[model samples]
Target: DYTNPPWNAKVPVQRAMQWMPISQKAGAAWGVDPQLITAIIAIQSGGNPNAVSKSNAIGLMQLKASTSGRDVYRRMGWSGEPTTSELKNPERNISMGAAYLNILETGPLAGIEDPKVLQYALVVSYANGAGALLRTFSSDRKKAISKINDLDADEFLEHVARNHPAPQAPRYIYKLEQALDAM
Candidate 1:
């Protein structure tokens, strides 16, 4: 007789809460929005610390060792090794991605932190130059980061939806809203 895999069994939220302090510590070290990181990981891999993408992006963040991603990895002096398999590990992947985002948000590679501008710029910039986009919009960084974060998840996702190739309205708004509010 066939049965569900024990390894796939769900952990109760209460039990998972045990990891909050550790998770937050890890997340904060990288300047990631804790909830956003959780949401992305949850949605991206259903909390599987190990996940492999079709493109061979390994880890919770589905990070492919692209030239840019790799360059950033090396520049950060990440303790974790960069590899397809390592990318499949949630702890390692989240640490790398969160730290990378922190770099984008702060260092010479500074990214617009306003979730609003980021909503637009990140989408395009991930595809182009978000910093340049920020330059075209505002001279002030604080104002821009504040504006970016002001948007609700749906609005943020909508910005990305508009530019997506298929161009359909984001159906994940409800899911994103739920995830966003969880923090």
Candidate 2:
């Protein structure tokens, strides 16, 4: 079910095209790559703004209101999580999703010093969570960061592909990469 509500490979990219400008803006605002945002939109919602998963992860980024949604709202100086209607809005959703990716990069995964390493970390961290992603390397956060730092980008990706605790984490990274290429 990796390709939920599946569309042809090109279809997701097609749908993603309309959101490009906003995604680009978000990229600048959050210091995340717009191409990464485009790929996430392709994999997570396949460009369908109204897409709602069985998990109730709504809109383009497939975010849960209580988790990433809450994080972005709080980051924005808003008081609470995003509402269903708000998340369903493409502009709002892209901005929030971009903001959350930045939060992940500059927050929990900050210990990872390399930009390439940080990029891979964000892909998996968004699919799973930064804590879970780190725990796969070691129980101790410092040790995990050290392990992550020791690996080159490809090595880190291969390690996650083989060793991440969650099955979906690796699959998500695969899909994200595929989506990245498609777009």
Candidate 3:
């Protein structure tokens, strides 16, 4: 059963009940929203514990291999350098990703407070810190608020594309919904 993914779409939230401790720990440490954390996984990985990205991002939170947020990861007290093996584990990935996000939330974009603005900035920062993608504030509101409003990942991605161009937001909702359903 470990290899077989239970596709009920309920596992994402249920597993989130457990897997979220990592994020809750990070969020509490940094004042980020735990529900937002769950919402992010729902949009990004669809709760696939074993999901991997074309960008080499891994696990429930999709931490990219070449992400520059490692310093933040370290500063947030993450134990050690996360490996691909570790990134595939829900607990390990979400813990480190949440911590890393907290760091980015306070990094060069330290002034950002709104969760939507923060997530949009986080996405751009995670993508090598392009900064150019951060130009549109209106789209930031869209992705942050509307990305996971029970919308399927594809439709949501299209919305993100129309609302916030350049940063291609990937759709993982169906998989996440399936994962949540499994639980």
Candidate 4:
């Protein structure tokens, strides 16, 4: 009596287009790349607004409450915990996710002109955490964050792939890059 859900590659792409306006708006406001946002949503939830990860991450971005929800909520100037339904809403979900990405891209890796390195750091930080990313490069968090701005794209990826304990960090970046190219 068990059957896997049907899949169609085009369905997700179409759905991503449907949500483009909101995604674009949020990306513009937060200074995030719209294609990156679309890619994340497509890969994270397959453009499914109702999607929820087993870890309790919700909506298009697969955002987890403990991981990013609280900080993003506060950044949005909203008080209190965000409800599950709120995360399920496309507008709220995309905006919050974009904001989080912008923070990761601009906050820690600011002044880094290389988009590739910035993107690598962002995806790794998103998959892991700011702390783990800092630990991967150096013992001193501030120094690591500063050092990240200096590494070339390939060097950054190689360092992260070699030193990070979790394999998903690299894979997540690969998938995200693939999705970006696909879009």
Candidate 5:
């Protein structure tokens, strides 16, 4: 039925299989990891191209056109807001989503030194914003990075889960790990 997500695409592993190659290409181009990109697709859409959240997050990466969608457009020098169809278009969604991650690492979260720590921060910041994530440690970017860099990758992931103000932010990293393991 049109009301339900398609069965084949609903499974994370199954859907990741279909989107993995596209994510690889996008990840390579955007300088994000393909596995992380696939995990995001799983969490965001469960592989359903037509998925739409109540909050208006659309497509595989669950981008709100005004937020990550617009940020991606501006970063890429594209004009105007993304239409729902463009956001719902799976390939575009994954590409845009990967680009958003790249933006986070290079832009707001650049002070993070450890690669793994940066990636974990990216995972959290992608769900929550970098400001909130950094503020959880300290308002100052350097202090926040020092705090974040102090922990090992796993410790940083756990710390964010426990410390982030947004409760859902805590769950995001765990879900990402699950998706990546499935991949």
Candidate 6:
């Protein structure tokens, strides 16, 4: 049943109910919207903590083993390296993912002062990598925000794909926006 599953945003939200408290706590701690985290978890792993991508992205947030996992452990008070299996832990995954999202918005995309534009950059960066995102924007955060603010969802998706086709960035933003709309 896992293969070609039906589309149901509510299903993942319902399945993730048990971790909602922790998710909200993590979001609050990192100044991210809790609903954003919920939407991401739904899309990234469909609330399945054991989910693993073909690229070895693991857990609910699909943290890549080589990047986000190590960053999470370092943030978690671990002095050294961490393993991918540890990211399969829902609490750790959600916490680290939320923290990373926070970093994305407040760090790389920080130059954008507009809230809406900031959210878009954060969502796109979460789906794609920050480096790709920066490159897409030509390393000009304000210009990127300005461009994103004028486009509708479809146009925005196309714009991003045409400008910087970083693996599924278009679909990822579209999916997240749809999930948010449904919410």
lDDT (C-alpha, whole model) for all candidates: 0.50, 0.84, 0.56, 0.77, 0.81, 0.73
Query: Quick one: how many clashes does candidate 3 have?
Result: 14
Candidate 2 lDDT tens digits, 32-128: 8998998888878889999998879989888889999989888878888889999999888999899999999877787888877777888889978
Give candidate 1 regions above 4 Å deviation: 1-22, 77-81, 107-159, 166-174
Model 5 residue runs over 4 Å out of place are 1-10
lDDT for predicted candidate 1 compared with the true structure = 0.50
Lowest lDDT sum, 10 consecutive residues, model 1, at: 1-10
Per-residue lDDT tens digits for candidate 6, residues 15-72, read 6555778789999888888888888888787788999889889888888867766665
> What's the lDDT for residue 157 in model 2?
79
Top model number, TM-score: 2
TM-score of each: 0.58, 0.89, 0.57, 0.86, 0.89, 0.80
| Regions of model 2 farther than 4 Å from truth | 1-8
> Could you arrange the candidates by lDDT from highest to lowest?
2, 5, 4, 6, 3, 1
**Judged by lDDT against the true structure, how good is candidate 5?**
0.81
Please provide, for model 1 over 60-119, each residue's C-alpha lDDT reduced to its tens digit, 9 standing for 90 to 100. 545567743574567677543477666655566777656655655564235445554443
Clashing residue pairs, candidate 5?
none
Best by lDDT: 2
Task: Write candidate 5's Cα lDDT for 1-183 as tens digits.
Answer: 111232232377677669888899899999988888887788777788898888898988888898888899999888877999998787898999999999998888987888877777887888778899999888888888888878998788777766788877756766766666675
Better of 1 and 4 by lDDT: 4
Q: Which ten-residue region of model 4 has the weakest summed lDDT? A: 1-10
- Where in model 4 is the C-alpha error above 4 Å? 1-14
